[PDB]
């Protein structure tokens, strides 16, 4: 129990409750160290250089410095720390936009509400939130501007439900209207513990003398939004991360990709290659310095033992060969992925100009997980829909009307009974002249739009009237009657006034009684009194309830409307049937006593009132049906269809009711009319099994057709899904979910949105994306591999907690097809090239151990070897990783089947990784064996009999190994921009001018003193400029002749699209 | 448009790019063009390596195999010669001993033609690990410069040859201790009507080695020779016994360590006049024993080429790439016609 006092901020602070801040940052000052080190030392190369630097600390291993590896290990750990500090500041800035918002708090000293910040709110404060601004915390309402004490909250962020909830104050506390009398109430609120069950609260607020009960009818959660009320008085009871909705959200977790998981298996491949070459050279050293100890006495070798010598040069060959694993790879994998996320969020085709929000990639380490996406776990309200309803169609007197007629069925075919589409203008033309039969029926329809509702209108200073509707479908019916001509104006108690724009005269209708809406009834009935003195009954409701209660002998257009109810449901529009009947006073004077039968039973009201109303709806005359559409966002059906052409299975998880989720899926074409929905709506644990078993029995009973797979769908209730996620029934649900084309989950909790995404990634080796808005799917976004949020609207708690935040749903098409499949081919090729080019230089250090008696002597100076991964081979990884477009943007969207290249993993695996190493072994053997044959005795020069020494030959090994690894990159690249022309041929021209400057200036400063006469004996020699020509072309003739044979006589599917790009 | 990203060619990832394709109109005229330029360089670099004419005599095992009294014939395996003409008299050795245990091998070869270009004299050492990691760095670069470096301020790369009896070894380390000391006589002494052919011992080393190696600045009271120099300098160093390593070109040539276990080292040359044809003799006093390293010391008499000797391995590599590119220019052309 959370005992909360009402009017003393010093008393509740002794409990030490939480504050009001909401932080979506990965780190803070209390855990930046044990969390950043865990994600760096889960990479296997950073574990390798930590045990390479620990080998350089025993004394007599290698004459290179003791702090040359651990110095660079801190350098690669500083760069990856400043990137995760840059990003976590940007997450902290977006949290400052929430905690610094305005929230009016009461003051005991000032005796009036003071304006403050959100973060200053404590548990127990009395706050006053105004008309259309969101709720700051979990508050119980004390009063409101409405007379009884009710208010209307919108719960489209804590649910998906689009209607407005009636939150009312208690009548024992709604007498605190004025701000000056708020100080005289004392007492405590014995509240419940923090939960995540939204629709259940239990408390006990004791006032000055006795206790009042609490209930979820006066509990307002934090994600809600006050609406259609001027102000309320609330008491903050849960705040910050102790709320009902944001309780199970956490800090941004560590998210490793699938490319990064392959690198930890390519390092183990490279590490067991490393142990082999160390074991060869350390056995060949202990054999040769023992068998040839009589022919090596000019070295004065110690010869301690065979074991002590073997354990000594096991480490000196570790340090010499430790540069096979590149340390410059893991900075240029973090800087490429950071510079790819900057280029994603700089695209104008992913910028939403209406609310002025461009896309942002908050987590740059996941830009290649967008290239291999198997599933999409969407949300419905706000993600797929605009949360705006609109009166779309009416069908009356056997006709059917829309304003915007599409040209597919504009021709009313006149197939006996009229089916087709006519304009709303022709609706008014058959209303005007009295000679038509439908005109007594058309106005009786058109008054039912503007009178049968329960909307409370209000005027503004402009005169444009705004309607306050408790349900958005009823509000669209009034506006649908308003633009047709029957405007609804001022509502006083117990009569309704309607302004008729047809005649121009202002009418009035005496409202006698209305029966409330009930989900059990699914009707809404309203008896009225007219200027005629005549009593007519208006009734609106679903087609499945009132069509049973008609006089089919009276009305003659029932067969047309039921077929008009069939093509409306084929477009997913929400429908209601409209019925009427004239009644007399004498049956009404008794039916008033039937209403007074319900006035006698205050003890029973759900059972008594509604079927006492249904005593008079025993027979009706049908007017017709209406069709209200739930608006989807722009380009939603075009991206549901395109992402399914790419092989991505789209699920939809919502908090809405079941029947409106199917209506959405029929309108975005996620479900077709010729599809077999497998509805699983059960209430016990084993009936969910029995439903799942009979579905999966009747699927393997028959042979699956190639089109019967694409005519199968699944619909789960949130109570059935609470049983089907249990470990017993986990597999029957998943084996039927793999067969159906589209899955829809309804009534689903915020945790059950996360437990589904956890259940799919556990059982399948597939990558999942979760897109949503609102804080009901923050747990869904934090549990996926990529979490996308919707930004630009209020309540964007999912756009903060996500890795990517986009403008709207239709930007998911270019973000996956174009920017994902680019950023998978880019990072996979730039990583394999960086593994390759470290091999093609540092393997000439291994073919040299057979020509220097297994001593481990290097053939380049260690300053010049350090400049390899820092100056002359850093930019061709960057240009390949940031600017390489293997296939264009307009052809990636025309052919969505090219998404299955990354989806299978056809650019990055261990098997492709072995071919870049075996090409690196092959290229290094051409450099070595090609140069020990030319520089035979050191006798390759023509300078007065002088010879070429060790260092004049190892420059030829170094330079030829640069033109090869830069010549390999020039075959790998697909497009040649101006940034490629400075990276591949501008790193070669960099080295050819750096070396006569470095070796002529730096040896005079006692730095790399080996290079005293090397420039005269390399660059002045004619054999250097001949080894630099033929020996690269020797090694790159196999990579060039296979590139011609692969694209001509054995092509992949993207090699043809690249040829379409070049020649069309 | 405050937060709208810029509409430039760089930010919108639409840069002016060129896309290469490996069409048969591009790849096949490349391989024919590469083959027709790597063959004139391939034949041009084999003719230049054929034009080099030399003579190599492996004078290891002259200690035991040679004859003391008369010139007898050297075996077939020790001689390797390349000349524009044929030789009539195969080369002969003789062992010649002086007053105290100092033998000199007397090779007597024949030069069948006037070698009109410059003559260089090397010695080829095989199975000597000049490129060992313990060996390459084992000297002190300040003693080479000439300054009197003290004992504990001296380098530590001289691991066992740093100091002896607490005195400073002046040429320090392993590269100077194991110096090759077979003294090649500075004249090709002509036998039977051919004149003598004088050789020189100056400007052998690199020009940066003649500038860095300077005369030392210790007096001899502090220093001591290396352990394998004591037969040349008995009783230590005196002031007139001191070797300047500035004018000692054979020290600078040996200290410039080689890349491979089979290396040349230049010893003598004449670049002014050509040697005419005739029978010559080279006296080589045998100080350096081959049991120290286990290989073959040898006497090489070479000429220079553009690539610097008789080495076919550069002109052959220009012919393999010209042969590979002209083979697959045929394999991919018969597939272009008979398998479209
Ligand atoms: C010591 C311990 C280590 C033991 C390790 C031993 C075995 C490893 C274990 C298992 C290995 C497993 C599999 C290995 C077998 C095959 C590898 C998988 C095949 C593979 O994709 O890689 C290939 C390497 O092509 C070699 O193969 C390369 C061919 C050259 C190989 C020659 C043999 C080298 C042997 C070493 C020589 C050592 C000599 C010893 C000298 C001693 C000196 C004293 C990749 O280059 P690739 O040009 O084809 O790339 C293609 C192509 O270039 C491109 O046109 C296409 O894309 P686009 O059209 O869009 O651009 C696209 O098709 C692309 O893939
Ligand atoms: C490369 O080419 C030649 C190799 O044969 C060589 O020049 C020949 O050798 C010597 C050196 O000049 C010449 O013979 C001497 O010439 C001088 C000239 O005045 C005479 O004084 C000398 O007479 C005697 O020489 C004795 C030593 O042999 C000495 O003890 C006496 O006191 C007296 O001085 C010789 O007659 C010969 O004619 C040269 N021939 C030709 C065709 O040039 C080059 O110097 C050599 N270059 C090098 C090694 O740099
Ligand atoms: C040409 O170069 C040859 C190889 O570099 C060199 O041959 C070596 O010469 C050294 C010194 O003359 C020899 O070392 C001797 O070793 C024997 C053991 O067999 C020792 O009796 C003796 O060392 C002694 O050390 C004592 C302290 O322990 C001390 O009293 C003395 O100082 C004494 O030096 C010798 O030093 C070595 O065996 C030779 N052969 C090899 C294969 O190294 C030639 O001398 C050199 N000749 C010339 C003319 O320069
Ligand atoms: C050119 O060659 C001749 C022939 O060997 C050299 O003459 C020798 O000089 C030394 C030096 O004193 C004498 O001991 C020899 O007796 C000389 N030999 C003969 C056959 O006379 C001459 O020194 C060489 N020229 C130069 C400049 O070194
Ligand atoms: Mg939503």
Structure-token pair, residue B29: 């005229």
A910 lines ligand 1 (CB under 6 A): no
Assign residue A197 a region (left: φ > 0; alpha: ψ between -120 and 50; beta: otherwise). beta
B9 belongs to a structural domain: no
Determine the longest span between alpha carbons in chain B, in angstroms.
106
Any idea which residue has 């076919």 for tokens? B312
Phi, psi of B30 (to 5 degrees): -75, -45
> If you ran DSSP here, which 8-state letter would residue A134 be given?
B
Contact B129, A299 (CB under 8 A): yes
Residues of B in contact with A294 (CB under 8 A): 291, 294
Structure-token pair, residue A1040: 């060039």
Q: How many CA atoms lie within 13 A of A254 on its CB side?
A: 13
The answer to whether residues A43 and A188 belong to one domain is yes
Distance B251 CA to ligand 2 centre (A): 27
The answer to whether residues A643 and A541 belong to one domain is no
For a mutational test of ligand 2's pocket, the pick from B190, B198, B202, B274, i.e. the residue with the most ligand atoms closer than 8 A to its C-beta, is: B198
> If you ran DSSP here, which 8-state letter would residue A365 be given?
G
Domain span holding position B180 = 54-334
For chain B, helix, strand, coil in percent to 5 are 25, 20, 55
Q: Which residues of A are catalytic?
A: 379
Which chain A residue shows the shortest CA-CA distance from B136? A857
Report helix, strand or coil for A559: helix
B25 belongs to a structural domain: no
B14 belongs to a structural domain: no
CA distance A841 to A961: 6
> Which ligand 1 atom sits closest to the C-alpha of A912?
21
B34 belongs to a structural domain: no
Residues of A in contact with B130 (CB under 8 A): 950
CATH of the domain at A593: 3.40.1110.10
Which ligand does the CA of B180 lie closest to?
3
Which chain B residue shows the shortest CA-CA distance from A1060? B21
Residues of A in contact with B302 (CB under 8 A): 939
Structure-token pair, residue B9: 């060619």
The answer to whether residues A445 and A552 belong to one domain is yes
Technique behind this structure? cryo-EM
Contact A105, A114 (CB under 8 A): yes
Inter-axis angle of helices A1024-1035 and A910-934, to 10 degrees? 150
A753 is in an annotated binding site: yes
The answer to whether residues A591 and A645 belong to one domain is no
B273 lines ligand 2 (CB under 6 A): yes
CA distance A380 to A390: 17
> Which ligand 1 atom sits closest to the C-alpha of A1039?
48
Which chain A residue shows the shortest CA-CA distance from B268? A945
Contact A301, A293 (CB under 8 A): yes
Three-class SS of B269-310 = EECCCCECCEEEEEEEECCCCCCCCCCCCEEEEECCCCCCCC
Q: Which residue, among A937, A985, A1022, would best test binding to B if mutated, counting the most B CBs under 10 Å from its CB? A: A937
Ion ligand 5 residues within 5 Å by Cβ? A 379, 381-382, 773-774
The answer to whether residues A294 and A365 belong to one domain is no
Any idea which residue has 């080589």 for tokens? B284
For chain A, helix, strand, coil in percent to 5 are 45, 15, 40
Structure-token pair, residue B317: 């590599």
End-of-domain residue from the set A792, A814, A836? A814
> Which ligand 2 atom sits closest to the C-alpha of B199?
49
A491 is in an annotated binding site: no
Distance B187 CA to ligand 3 centre (A): 29
CA distance B274 to B277: 10
Q: A921: distance to nearest CA of chain B, Å?
A: 19
Determine the longest span between alpha carbons in chain A, in angstroms.
134
B42 belongs to a structural domain: no
Q: Which residue, among A879, A881, A946, A1043, would best test binding to B if mutated, counting the most B CBs under 10 Å from its CB? A: A946
The answer to whether residues A447 and A589 belong to one domain is yes
A337 belongs to a structural domain: no
The answer to whether residues A741 and A644 belong to one domain is yes
Which protein residues touch ligand 3 with a CB less than 6 Å away?
A: B 178, 181, 227-228, 230-232, 287-289, 292
A961 is in an annotated binding site: no
**Buried-state track A149-161, b at ≥16 Cβ within 10 A, e below 16:** bbbbbbbbbbbbb
A1 lines ligand 1 (CB under 6 A): no
Number of compact structural domains in chain A? 4
Q: Is the dihedral of CA A1004, A1005, A1009, A1015 positive or negative?
A: negative
Any idea which residue has 């330079």 for tokens? A959
CATH of the domain at A356: 3.40.50.1000
B12 belongs to a structural domain: no
Structure-token pair, residue A1035: 């090694």
Rounding to the nearest 10 degrees, give the CA dihedral for residues A404, A409, A410, A415.
Answer: -140
A655 is in an annotated binding site: yes
Cα distances from A486 to residues A115, A507, A685, A900, in angstroms, run 44, 10, 52, 55
B251 belongs to a structural domain: yes
Closest Cβ–Cβ partner in A300, A936, A1043 for B22 = A1043
Distance A156 CA to ligand 5 centre (A): 7
CA distance A692 to A678: 10
A221 belongs to a structural domain: yes
Q: Is the dihedral of CA B256, B257, B259, B261 positive or negative?
A: positive
End-of-domain residue from the set A791, A814, A837? A814
End-of-domain residue from the set A631, A647, A666? A631
A336 belongs to a structural domain: no
- Which residue from A246, A338, A348 is spatially nearest to A807, judged by alpha carbons? A348
Please give the resolution of this entry in Å, rounded to 1 decimal: 2.9
The answer to whether residues A780 and A825 belong to one domain is no
The answer to whether residues A229 and A274 belong to one domain is no
The answer to whether residues A788 and A838 belong to one domain is no
The answer to whether residues A153 and A269 belong to one domain is no
Number of compact structural domains in chain B? 1
Domain span holding position A724 = 342-384+634-814
The answer to whether residues A900 and A963 belong to one domain is yes
């Amino acid at each position: 129990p959370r005992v909360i006092h009402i009017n003393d901020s010093l008393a509740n602070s002794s409990f030490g409750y939480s504050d009001n801040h909401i932080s979506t940052t990965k780190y803070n000052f209390a855990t930046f160290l044990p969390k950043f080190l865990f994600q760096e030392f889960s990479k296997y190369a950073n574990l390798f250089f930590l045990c390479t630097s620990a080998i350089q600390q025993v004394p007599h291993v290698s004459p290179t410095n003791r702090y040359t590896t651990i110095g660079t290990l801190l350098v690669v750990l500083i760069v990856s720390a400043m990137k995760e500090c840059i990003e976590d500041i940007k997450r902290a800035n977006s949290d400052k936009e929430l905690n610094n918002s305005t929230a009016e708090i009461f003051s005991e000293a000032h005796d009036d509400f003071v304006e403050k910040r959100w973060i200053d709110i404590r548990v127990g404060d009395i706050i006053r939130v105004k008309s259309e601004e969101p709720i700051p915390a979990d508050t119980i309402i004390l009063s409101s501007s409405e007379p009884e004490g009710l208010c209307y909250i919108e719960t489209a962020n804590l649910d998906g439900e689009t209607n407005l909830k009636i939150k009312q104050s208690r009548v024992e506390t709604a007498k605190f209207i004025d701000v000056k009398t708020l100080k005289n109430m004392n007492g405590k609120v014995v509240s419940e513990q923090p939960n995540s069950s939204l629709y259940t609260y239990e408390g006990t607020m004791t006032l000055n003398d006795r206790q009042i009960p609490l209930s979820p009818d006066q509990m307002i959660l934090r994600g809600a939004t006050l609406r259609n009320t001027a102000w309320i008085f609330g008491l903050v009871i849960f705040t910050g991360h102790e709320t009902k909705l944001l309780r199970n959200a956490t800090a941004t977790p560590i998210k490793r990709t699938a490319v990064e998981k392959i690198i930890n298996r390519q390092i183990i491949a490279l590490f067991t290659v490393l142990i082999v070459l160390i074991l060869i050279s350390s056995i060949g050293n202990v054999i040769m310095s023992t068998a040839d100890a009589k022919h090596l006495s000019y070295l004065y070798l110690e010869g301690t033992n065979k074991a002590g010598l073997f354990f000594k040069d096991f480490l000196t060959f570790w340090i010499l060969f430790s540069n096979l694993v590149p340390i410059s790879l893991f900075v240029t994998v973090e800087l490429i992925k950071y510079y790819q996320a900057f280029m994603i969020g700089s695209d104008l085709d992913l910028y939403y100009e209406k609310t002025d929000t461009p896309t942002v990639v908050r987590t740059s380490s996941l830009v290649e997980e967008l290239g291999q996406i198997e599933y999409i776990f969407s949300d419905k309200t706000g993600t797929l829909t605009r949360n705006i309803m609109e009166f779309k169609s009416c069908s009356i007197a056997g006709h059917c009307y829309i304003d915007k007629i599409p040209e597919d069925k504009t021709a009313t075919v006149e197939d006996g009974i009229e089916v087709g589409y006519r304009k709303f203008d022709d609706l008014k033309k058959k209303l005007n002249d009295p000679s038509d039969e439908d005109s007594p029926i058309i106005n009786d329809f058109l008054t039912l739009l503007a009178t049968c509702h329960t909307v409370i209108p209000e005027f503004q200073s402009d005169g444009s009237i705004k309607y306050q509707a408790a349900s958005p479908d009823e509000g669209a019916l009034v506006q649908g009657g308003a633009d047709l001509g029957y405007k609804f104006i001022i509502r006083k108690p117990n009569s309704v006034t309607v302004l008729l724009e047809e005649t121009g005269e202002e009418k009035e209708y005496q409202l006698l009684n209305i029966c409330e809406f009930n989900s059990t009834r699914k009707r809404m009935s309203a008896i009225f009194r007219f200027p005629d003195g005549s009593i007519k009954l208006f009734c609106k409701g679903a087609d499945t309830v009132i069509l049973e209660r008609l006089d089919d002998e009276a009305n003659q257009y029932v067969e047309a409307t039921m077929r008009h109810l069939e093509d409306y449901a084929s477009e997913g529009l929400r429908t209601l049937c409209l019925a009427m009947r004239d009644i007399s006073e004498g049956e009404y004077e008794e039916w008033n006593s039937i209403y007074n039968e319900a006035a006698t039973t205050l003890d029973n009201r759900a059972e008594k009132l509604d079927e006492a109303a249904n005593l008079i709806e025993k027979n009706l005359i049908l007017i017709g049906a209406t069709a209200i559409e739930d608006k989807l966002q722009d380009g939603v059906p075009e991206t549901i269809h395109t992402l399914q052409e790419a092989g991505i299975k789209i699920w939809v998880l919502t908090g809405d009711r079941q029947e409106t989720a199917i209506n959405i899926g029929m309108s975005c074409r996620l479900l077709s009319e010729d599809m077999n929905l497998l509805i699983i709506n059960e209430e016990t644990r084993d009936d969910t099994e029995r439903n799942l078993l009979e579905k999966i029995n009747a699927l393997n009973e028959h042979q699956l057709s190639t089109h019967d797979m694409n005519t199968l769908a699944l619909v789960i209730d949130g109570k059935s899904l609470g049983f089907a996620l249990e470990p017993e029934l986990e597999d029957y649900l998943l084996t039927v979910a793999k067969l159906c084309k589209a899955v829809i989950c309804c009534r689903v909790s915020p945790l059950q949105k996360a437990l589904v995404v956890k259940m799919v990634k556990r059982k399948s080796s597939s990558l999942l994306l979760a897109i949503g808005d609102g804080a009901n799917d923050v747990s869904m976004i934090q549990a996926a591999h990529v979490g996308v949020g919707i930004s630009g609207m209020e309540g964007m708690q999912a756009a903060r907690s996500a890795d990517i935040a986009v403008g709207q749903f239709k930007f998911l098409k270019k973000l996956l097809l174009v920017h994902g499949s680019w950023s998978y081919q880019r990072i996979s090729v730039a990583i394999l090239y960086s593994f390759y080019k470290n091999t093609a230089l540092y393997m000439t250090q291994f073919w040299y151990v057979f020509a220097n008696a297994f001593s481990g002597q290097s053939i380049m100076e260690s300053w010049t070897m350090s400049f390899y991964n820092l100056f002359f081979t850093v930019w061709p990884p960057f240009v390949i990783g940031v600017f390489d477009q293997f296939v264009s943007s307009r052809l990636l969207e025309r052919y969505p089947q090219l998404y299955k290249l990354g989806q299978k993993g056809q650019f990055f695996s261990v098997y492709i990784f072995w071919g870049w190493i075996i090409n690196g072994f092959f290229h290094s053997a051409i450099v070595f064996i090609g140069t020990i044959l030319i520089y035979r005795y050191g006798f390759a020069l023509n300078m007065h009999g002088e010879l070429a020494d060790h260092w004049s030959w190892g420059v030829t090994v170094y330079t030829t190994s640069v033109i090869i690894v830069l010549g390999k990159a020039a075959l790998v690249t697909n497009q040649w921009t101006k940034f490629t022309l400075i990276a591949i041929p501008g790193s070669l021209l960099f080295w050819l001018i750096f070396f006569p400057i470095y070796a002529s200036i730096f040896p005079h400063a006692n730095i790399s003193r080996e290079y005293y006469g090397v420039v005269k004996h390399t660059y002045g020699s004619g054999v250097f400029w001949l080894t630099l020509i033929v020996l690269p072309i020797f090694a790159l003739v196999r990579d060039f002749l296979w590139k011609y044979y692969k694209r001509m006589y054995e092509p992949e599917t993207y090699h043809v699209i690249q040829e379409m790009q070049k020649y069309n | 448009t405050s937060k709208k990203p810029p509409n430039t060619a760089f930010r919108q990832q639409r840069l002016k790019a060129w896309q290469p394709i490996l069409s048969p109109q591009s790849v096949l005229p490349l391989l024919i063009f590469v083959a027709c330029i790597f063959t004139p360089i391939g034949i041009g670099l084999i003719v230049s390596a054929t034009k080099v004419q030399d003579l190599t005599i492996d004078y290891s095992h002259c200690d035991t195999k040679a004859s003391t009294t008369a010139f007898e014939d050297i075996p077939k395996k020790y001689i390797k010669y390349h000349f524009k003409s044929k030789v009539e008299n195969k080369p002969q050795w003789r062992l010649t001993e002086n007053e105290n245990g100092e033998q000199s091998c007397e090779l007597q070869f024949e030069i069948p033609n006037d070698i009109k270009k410059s003559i260089f004299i090397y010695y080829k050492i095989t199975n000597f690990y000049q490129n060992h990691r313990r060996y390459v760095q084992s000297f002190d670069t300040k003693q080479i410069l000439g300054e009197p470096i003290k004992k504990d301020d001296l380098d530590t790369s001289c691991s066992p040859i740093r100091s002896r009896e607490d005195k400073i070894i002046y040429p320090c380390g392993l590269i100077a201790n194991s110096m090759f000391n077979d003294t090649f006589s500075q004249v090709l002494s002509g036998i039977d009507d051919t004149e003598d052919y004088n050789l020189t011992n100056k400007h052998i080393s690199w020009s940066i080695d003649r500038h860095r190696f300077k005369t030392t600045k210790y007096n001899a009271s502090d220093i001591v020779p290396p352990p394998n120099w004591m037969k040349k300098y008995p009783d230590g160093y005196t002031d007139e016994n001191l070797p300047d390593i500035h004018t000692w070109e054979e020290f600078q040539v040996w200290m410039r360590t080689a890349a491979f276990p089979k290396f040349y080292k230049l010893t003598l040359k004449n670049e002014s006049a050509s040697l005419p044809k005739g029978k010559y003799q080279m006296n080589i006093e045998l100080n350096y024993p081959i049991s120290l390293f286990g290989g073959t010391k040898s006497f090489v008499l070479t000429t220079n080429g553009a690539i610097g000797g008789r080495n076919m391995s550069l002109g052959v590599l220009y012919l393999i790439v010209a042969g590979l590119c002209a083979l697959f220019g045929i394999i991919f052309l018969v597939k272009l016609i008979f398998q479209p």
